[PDB]
Coordinates of C-alpha atoms and ligand atoms in Angstrom, one line a residue:
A18 CA 142.6 261.9 195.7
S19 CA 141.0 263.7 198.6
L20 CA 138.1 263.2 201.0
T21 CA 135.4 264.8 198.8
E22 CA 136.9 263.1 195.7
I23 CA 136.8 259.8 197.6
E24 CA 133.1 260.2 198.7
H25 CA 132.2 261.2 195.1
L26 CA 133.9 258.0 193.9
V27 CA 131.8 256.0 196.4
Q28 CA 128.6 257.6 195.1
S29 CA 129.7 257.0 191.5
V30 CA 130.6 253.3 192.0
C31 CA 127.3 252.7 193.8
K32 CA 125.3 254.4 191.1
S33 CA 127.1 252.5 188.3
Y34 CA 126.3 249.2 190.1
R35 CA 122.6 250.0 190.6
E36 CA 122.1 250.8 186.9
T37 CA 123.8 247.5 185.9
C38 CA 122.2 245.4 188.5
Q39 CA 120.7 242.4 186.8
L40 CA 118.0 242.1 189.3
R41 CA 117.1 244.5 192.1
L42 CA 117.8 242.9 195.4
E43 CA 114.1 243.3 196.4
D44 CA 112.9 241.4 193.4
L45 CA 115.2 238.5 194.4
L46 CA 114.0 238.7 198.0
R47 CA 110.2 238.8 197.2
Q48 CA 110.7 235.5 195.3
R49 CA 112.2 233.6 198.2
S50 CA 108.9 231.7 198.9
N51 CA 108.8 230.5 195.3
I52 CA 110.7 227.2 195.6
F53 CA 110.9 224.4 193.0
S54 CA 108.6 221.5 193.8
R55 CA 110.1 218.1 194.3
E56 CA 108.6 217.2 190.9
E57 CA 110.1 220.2 189.3
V58 CA 113.5 219.3 190.8
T59 CA 113.2 215.8 189.5
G60 CA 112.6 217.2 186.0
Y61 CA 115.8 219.3 186.3
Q62 CA 117.8 216.2 187.4
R63 CA 116.5 214.2 184.4
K64 CA 117.3 216.7 181.8
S65 CA 120.3 215.7 179.7
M66 CA 123.8 216.8 180.7
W67 CA 124.2 218.8 177.5
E68 CA 120.9 220.7 177.7
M69 CA 121.5 221.7 181.4
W70 CA 125.0 223.0 180.4
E71 CA 123.5 225.0 177.5
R72 CA 120.8 226.5 179.8
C73 CA 123.2 227.4 182.6
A74 CA 125.9 228.7 180.2
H75 CA 123.2 231.0 178.7
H76 CA 122.2 232.2 182.1
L77 CA 125.8 232.8 183.0
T78 CA 126.3 234.8 179.9
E79 CA 123.3 237.0 180.6
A80 CA 124.8 237.8 184.0
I81 CA 128.2 238.4 182.4
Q82 CA 126.6 240.9 180.0
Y83 CA 125.5 243.1 182.9
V84 CA 129.0 242.9 184.4
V85 CA 130.4 244.3 181.1
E86 CA 128.0 247.2 181.3
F87 CA 129.0 247.8 185.0
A88 CA 132.6 248.1 183.7
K89 CA 131.7 250.6 180.9
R90 CA 130.0 252.8 183.5
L91 CA 132.8 252.5 186.1
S92 CA 135.0 255.6 186.6
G93 CA 138.3 255.2 184.9
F94 CA 137.7 251.8 183.3
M95 CA 137.0 253.3 179.9
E96 CA 140.1 255.4 180.2
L97 CA 142.2 252.3 180.4
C98 CA 143.4 251.0 177.0
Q99 CA 141.4 248.4 175.2
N100 CA 143.9 245.7 175.7
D101 CA 143.7 246.3 179.5
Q102 CA 139.9 246.6 179.4
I103 CA 139.8 243.1 177.8
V104 CA 142.3 241.6 180.2
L105 CA 140.3 242.9 183.1
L106 CA 136.9 241.6 181.9
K107 CA 138.4 238.4 180.6
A108 CA 139.7 237.5 184.0
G109 CA 137.2 239.3 186.3
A110 CA 133.8 239.0 184.7
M111 CA 133.2 235.5 186.1
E112 CA 134.5 236.7 189.5
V113 CA 132.1 239.7 189.7
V114 CA 129.2 237.3 188.8
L115 CA 130.2 234.7 191.4
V116 CA 130.2 237.5 194.0
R117 CA 127.0 239.1 192.7
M118 CA 125.5 235.6 193.0
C119 CA 125.2 235.7 196.8
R120 CA 122.3 238.2 196.5
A121 CA 120.4 235.4 194.7
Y122 CA 121.3 232.8 197.4
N123 CA 119.1 232.1 200.5
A124 CA 121.2 230.7 203.4
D125 CA 118.1 229.9 205.5
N126 CA 117.1 227.1 203.1
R127 CA 120.4 226.9 201.1
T128 CA 118.6 227.7 197.8
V129 CA 119.7 229.8 194.8
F130 CA 117.5 231.7 192.4
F131 CA 117.4 230.1 188.9
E132 CA 114.9 230.2 186.1
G133 CA 112.1 231.8 188.1
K134 CA 112.3 230.0 191.4
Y135 CA 114.7 228.9 194.2
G136 CA 116.2 225.4 194.3
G137 CA 119.0 223.7 196.3
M138 CA 122.1 222.2 194.8
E139 CA 120.4 219.0 193.8
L140 CA 118.7 221.0 191.1
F141 CA 122.1 220.9 189.2
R142 CA 122.9 217.2 189.4
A143 CA 122.6 216.7 185.7
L144 CA 125.7 218.8 185.0
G145 CA 128.1 216.3 186.4
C146 CA 130.2 218.9 188.2
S147 CA 129.0 218.5 191.8
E148 CA 132.3 219.9 193.3
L149 CA 132.0 223.1 191.3
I150 CA 128.4 223.4 192.4
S151 CA 128.9 222.9 196.1
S152 CA 131.9 225.2 196.0
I153 CA 129.8 228.0 194.5
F154 CA 127.0 227.3 197.1
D155 CA 129.5 227.3 200.0
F156 CA 131.2 230.4 198.6
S157 CA 127.8 232.1 198.4
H158 CA 127.0 230.9 201.9
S159 CA 130.2 232.5 203.2
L160 CA 129.3 235.8 201.6
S161 CA 125.7 235.7 202.7
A162 CA 126.9 235.5 206.3
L163 CA 128.6 238.9 206.0
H164 CA 125.2 240.4 205.1
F165 CA 126.7 242.7 202.4
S166 CA 124.7 245.8 201.7
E167 CA 124.2 246.7 198.0
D168 CA 126.6 249.6 198.4
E169 CA 129.2 247.2 199.7
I170 CA 128.6 244.8 196.8
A171 CA 129.2 247.6 194.3
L172 CA 132.4 248.8 195.9
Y173 CA 133.7 245.3 196.4
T174 CA 132.9 244.1 192.9
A175 CA 134.6 247.2 191.6
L176 CA 137.8 246.0 193.2
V177 CA 137.3 242.4 192.0
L178 CA 137.2 243.8 188.5
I179 CA 140.0 246.5 188.8
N180 CA 142.7 244.1 189.8
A181 CA 146.1 245.3 188.8
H182 CA 147.9 241.9 189.1
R183 CA 146.0 240.4 186.2
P184 CA 148.7 239.1 183.8
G185 CA 148.9 240.8 180.4
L186 CA 148.1 244.4 181.5
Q187 CA 149.9 247.0 179.4
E188 CA 149.4 250.1 181.7
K189 CA 149.9 248.4 185.1
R190 CA 150.6 251.6 186.9
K191 CA 147.4 253.2 185.6
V192 CA 145.4 250.2 186.8
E193 CA 147.3 250.4 190.2
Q194 CA 146.2 254.1 190.5
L195 CA 142.6 253.1 189.8
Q196 CA 142.7 250.1 192.1
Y197 CA 144.1 252.2 195.0
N198 CA 141.4 254.8 194.6
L199 CA 138.7 252.3 194.7
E200 CA 140.3 250.6 197.7
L201 CA 140.2 253.9 199.6
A202 CA 136.6 254.4 198.6
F203 CA 135.6 250.9 199.8
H204 CA 137.5 251.3 203.0
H205 CA 136.3 254.8 203.5
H206 CA 132.7 253.6 203.2
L207 CA 133.2 250.7 205.6
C208 CA 134.9 253.0 208.2
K209 CA 132.1 255.6 207.8
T210 CA 129.6 252.8 208.3
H211 CA 131.3 250.9 211.1
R212 CA 131.9 247.9 208.9
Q213 CA 135.6 247.5 208.7
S214 CA 135.1 244.2 210.5
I215 CA 134.1 242.5 207.3
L216 CA 137.6 243.1 206.0
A217 CA 139.1 240.2 207.8
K218 CA 136.2 238.0 206.6
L219 CA 136.4 238.6 202.8
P220 CA 137.4 235.7 200.6
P221 CA 141.1 235.5 199.7
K222 CA 141.5 236.4 196.0
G223 CA 142.9 232.9 195.6
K224 CA 139.4 231.6 196.2
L225 CA 137.8 233.5 193.4
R226 CA 140.6 232.2 191.2
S227 CA 139.9 228.7 192.4
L228 CA 136.2 228.8 191.5
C229 CA 137.0 230.2 188.0
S230 CA 139.6 227.6 187.3
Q231 CA 137.1 224.9 188.3
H232 CA 134.6 226.5 186.0
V233 CA 137.0 226.2 183.1
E234 CA 138.4 222.8 183.9
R235 CA 134.8 221.4 184.0
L236 CA 133.9 223.3 180.8
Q237 CA 136.8 221.6 179.0
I238 CA 135.7 218.2 180.1
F239 CA 132.1 218.9 179.0
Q240 CA 133.3 220.3 175.7
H241 CA 135.4 217.2 174.9
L242 CA 132.3 215.1 175.4
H243 CA 129.9 217.4 173.4
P244 CA 132.2 219.5 171.2
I245 CA 129.4 220.1 168.8
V246 CA 126.9 221.3 171.5
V247 CA 129.5 224.0 172.5
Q248 CA 130.1 224.9 168.9
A249 CA 126.5 225.1 167.9
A250 CA 124.6 226.2 171.1
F251 CA 126.8 227.9 173.7
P252 CA 126.7 231.7 173.7
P253 CA 129.6 233.2 171.6
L254 CA 130.7 235.5 174.4
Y255 CA 130.9 232.5 176.7
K256 CA 133.1 230.7 174.3
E257 CA 135.3 233.8 174.0
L258 CA 135.9 234.0 177.8
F259 CA 136.0 230.4 178.8
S260 CA 136.7 227.8 176.0
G261 CA 139.7 227.0 173.9
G262 CA 140.5 228.0 171.5
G263 CA 137.2 229.8 171.7
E264 CA 138.5 233.4 171.9
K265 CA 138.5 233.6 168.0
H266 CA 135.1 235.2 168.8
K267 CA 135.6 238.9 169.3
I268 CA 132.4 239.7 171.3
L269 CA 133.9 241.7 174.1
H270 CA 135.5 244.3 171.8
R271 CA 132.2 244.7 170.1
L272 CA 130.5 245.2 173.5
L273 CA 133.2 247.6 174.7
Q274 CA 132.9 250.0 171.7
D275 CA 129.1 249.9 171.1
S276 CA 128.2 253.1 173.0
Ligands
ENR1 C1 125.6 227.3 191.3 C2 124.2 227.1 190.6 N1 124.2 227.9 189.4 C3 124.9 227.6 188.3 C4 125.9 226.6 188.0 C5 126.5 226.6 186.8 C6 126.2 227.5 185.8 O1 126.8 227.6 184.5 C7 127.6 226.5 184.1 C8 126.6 225.4 183.6 C9 128.5 226.9 183.0 C10 125.2 228.5 186.0 C11 124.6 228.5 187.3 C12 123.6 229.4 187.8 C13 122.9 230.5 187.3 C14 122.0 231.1 188.1 C15 121.2 232.3 187.5 O2 121.6 232.9 186.6 N2 120.0 232.7 188.2 C16 119.3 233.9 187.7 C17 119.9 235.1 188.3 C18 119.6 236.3 187.8 C19 120.2 237.4 188.4 C20 121.0 237.3 189.5 S1 121.7 238.7 190.2 O3 120.8 239.9 190.1 O4 121.8 238.5 191.7 C21 123.3 239.1 189.4 C22 124.1 237.8 189.3 C23 121.3 236.1 190.0 C24 120.7 234.9 189.4 C25 121.7 230.7 189.4 C26 122.4 229.6 189.9 C27 123.4 229.0 189.1

């Protein structure tokens, strides 16, 4: 590429991210005073393990849906082959969400936006996966300290998705070319903005992997306890990405072709 082509890539990635923002950053910020009452938090903790999982899995899926749209509007993604498009989303959708999640996290009070209001990590006690939950909270605390801008979120999440070491890619070099061009864009924007210093403070990719593996390990435990809840009440797309052998659902392909 070239300088103008790189800056055009910066604007195109940032646009594609805004359009597929689930919630505008301002909407999330204006709600920061709206905090679950102690009584409301007690009600969350007393809900059954399997209903909490169903509600959270459904919210997770909604977020995942916006990440698919981001991909479809992202330069070069839709020129990749369908096998590679699915490998990328299958492995990176949960990662993009975990990163996007820091916009919904308030480090002042350590709360996360969820079902209309902000609550701390006790809100999630009914799930029986406190390690996962505190890892995600801590992970969102780390990212919140860097004070990402929205533009920086878009460029960074683009790279989280366009990761050419995902196993199973058929056109690895084509994904390499794309990844390298988004890296230059990201780094060009940080340099231009005097923000290269965040580069040494980004999470190792091994960390995003770790959280996703914890996600799936805890899903398998829950599914073994409530197999019929998963079969009858989890979102199909969620089963496709995360459960086993749940990928008999072909939702992603449907999503990727539907205009
Ligand atoms: C660690 C605590 N936590 C969860 C823990 C587990 C879990 O699912 C498992 C049960 C499978 C799901 C959640 C979960 C979901 C939300 C959520 O969706 N809030 C609504 C929202 C809407 C838009 C944005 S955004 O615009 O910033 C783009 C992402 C952010 C947030 C918040 C916290 C959560």
